[PDB]
Ligand binder design. Structure first.
Ligand SMILES: C[C@H](Cc1nc(=O)c2cnn(-c3ccccc3Cl)c2[nH]1)C(F)(F)F
Ligand SMILES: C[C@H](Cc1nc(=O)c2cnn(-c3ccccc3Cl)c2[nH]1)C(F)(F)F
Ligand SMILES: [Mg+2]
Ligand SMILES: [Mg+2]
Ligand SMILES: [Zn+2]
Ligand SMILES: [Zn+2]
Lengths: 319, 319
């Protein structure tokens, strides 16, 4: 069960995603669907809802970073944004359903090695998706194979036309998570910002791509205590890759290279050239987002810069 | 064993594809690869190249239209164009290898039901490819599945950098055969066309995309009875899809409805609004195309228009 305290904190981006076990996370995800009025407006069989969440969980891999806790993390942040930015006043329920469901399924069956590995290693994935966002494509397919089994199909009671609309929206959002397209997408969105139109369908599609992108890389928005472990879990996975990459001939990226990257320098670059700019333009649309999320981001940047001095200082010694 | 008479008619769009058998065509294909000096300039092992073309032939299905012969026509037409338009003076042997390989592989393992059926019926392909060019994506995938085996890999003797550029090219061409992108591709082309530039890598990519598109739907460019049978084979496959759709209760395209489609009306629109316009544009770059390909297309159009009059009169005589 969840205490009214937990259920209360579940709305803030300060929620401690580490305090829980799969079962307790499944319950929170479940709470979110009810509380958002999704179970209600889509006639989601409450039993199916919980069975779906179990099948989703079952399909996430036990990786150091790209795992079910990450999934929950992204979904929970998305949930926070819905209340923080009062999204239910700008988005239809079908839009919210898409944001939430896409967030929960965006990394289904992730293997721990990104697209670059897949393509360079000429993997069965990279071959099947002709080197086009192979991971993202795969997550999305698994997401719909799951929804294909009537028992997990939380969309049973939605008419075919509504299903089509929801499916197309989820695919757009999940593929939009591939960071390779980060600049392209930010340009498109900033271009629409010059005069945003909440009634312009294309304007909203980009805003939704931006929102799920925000949640998927929002770790640094959370409290320093909650955020740090994630950076280490990602680098574990990244090293796991660059290890296998160098011992296979396949090239390696600087940010995944032991001899080149450091938690601090990395996060200073990520926070300044990715996270703060992105959340900056989003603030022009949502002012409350500046205090609640752009603040910890600045703080986080500042802190990793102070940690950079000490890191460099220790480096001098081991030389 | 091709005679010298054959090796000569094989460079023209008047070649009768309906004569030869799988065995013989496989020879013509093999010939084309040597004749174009792809073996030479790339170091293709003449034995591997012969196995590969067999690996390929096996992977095509026994469909009335989308079968190994269609494959043959597309590559044979592509071959005719390399000679007619002297493409070896404009394109590198790399691009020529891409164009020919792409043409041969473009419909690998086609099931006989188009993307609309896949999408509407929510097939594995549709689910797997997220409704995005599911058939074409699958073809290009089965293509590289074959080049994956060490025994069919006709690219084995190519540096890493080389294989990359080839693969990307092939993915681009095969994915460009999806008619759903016709208007989009024709536009990008007609644009670059306002000031073509055989130097501009993007100008050339669009030309290669337009070249394979021409070859994929170029049946009407051939002689009246080499062409006519093809229209029949396509409808046999189409009616095969609509019968199954009606049965399964899925929507039916008009041009696949026995009570609506007539060869006459069909080929009139297709020739006037799809074929002729595309070749006219290509003729701006290669004037010699007008006499060898536009000519038969204009005759095809007129013939079909005359054929529709007959059909109107004939039917009026019955009501
Ligand atoms: C090199 C990474 C930088 C980085 N910082 C994050 O906070 C963060 C959040 N998500 N991702 C991420 C994860 C997977 C793929 C792409 C990204 Cl972007 C991140 N990557 C790190 F130093 F290890 F942190
Ligand atoms: C309804 C079709 C129209 C048509 N005419 C062709 O000559 C032609 C050549 N290729 N394709 C074709 C085949 C498969 C998919 C798309 C196209 Cl475009 C054709 N489609 C037919 F009148 F029945 F023929
Ligand atoms: Mg991902
Ligand atoms: Mg095709
Ligand atoms: Zn993710
Ligand atoms: Zn074809």
């Amino acid at each position: 069960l969840l205490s009214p305290e937990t259920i209360e904190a579940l709305r803030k981006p300060t929620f401690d995603v580490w305090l829980w076990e799969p079962n307790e996370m499944l319950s929170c995800l479940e709470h979110m669907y009810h509380d958002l009025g999704l179970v209600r407006d889509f006639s989601i069989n409450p039993v199916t809802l919980r069975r779906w969440l179990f099948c989703v969980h079952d399909n996430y891999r036990n990786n150091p970073f790209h795992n079910f806790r990450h999934c929950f993390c992204v979904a929970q942040m998305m949930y926070s944004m819905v209340w923080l930015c009062s999204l239910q006043e700008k988005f239809s329920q079908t839009d919210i359903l898409i944001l939430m469901t896409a967030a929960i399924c965006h990394d289904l069956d992730h293997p721990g090695y990104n697209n670059t590995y897949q393509i360079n290693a000429r993997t069965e994935l990279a071959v099947r998706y002709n080197d086009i966002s192979p991971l993202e494509n795969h997550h999305c397919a698994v997401a719909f194979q799951i929804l294909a089994e009537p028992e997990c199909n939380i969309f049973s009671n939605i008419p075919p036309d509504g299903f089509k609309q929801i499916r197309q929206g989820m695919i757009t959002l999940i593929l939009a998570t591939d960071m390779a397209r980060h600049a392209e997408i930010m340009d498109s969105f900033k271009e629409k910002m010059e005069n945003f139109d909440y009634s312009n369908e294309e304007h909203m599609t980009l805003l939704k791509m931006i929102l799920i992108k925000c949640c998927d890389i929002s770790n640094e928005v959370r409290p320093m205590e909650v955020a740090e472990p994630w950076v280490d879990c990602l680098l574990e996975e990244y090293f796991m890759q660059s290890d296998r990459e160098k011992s296979e001939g396949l090239p390696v990226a600087p940010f995944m290279d032991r001899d080149k990257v450091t938690k601090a320098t990395a996060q200073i670059g990520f926070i300044k050239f990715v996270l703060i700019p992105m959340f900056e333009t989003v603030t022009k649309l949502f002012p409350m987002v500046e205090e609640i999320m752009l603040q910890p981001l600045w703080e986080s940047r500042d802190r990793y810069e102070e940690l950079k001095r000490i890191d460099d200082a220790m480096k001098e010694l081991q030389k």
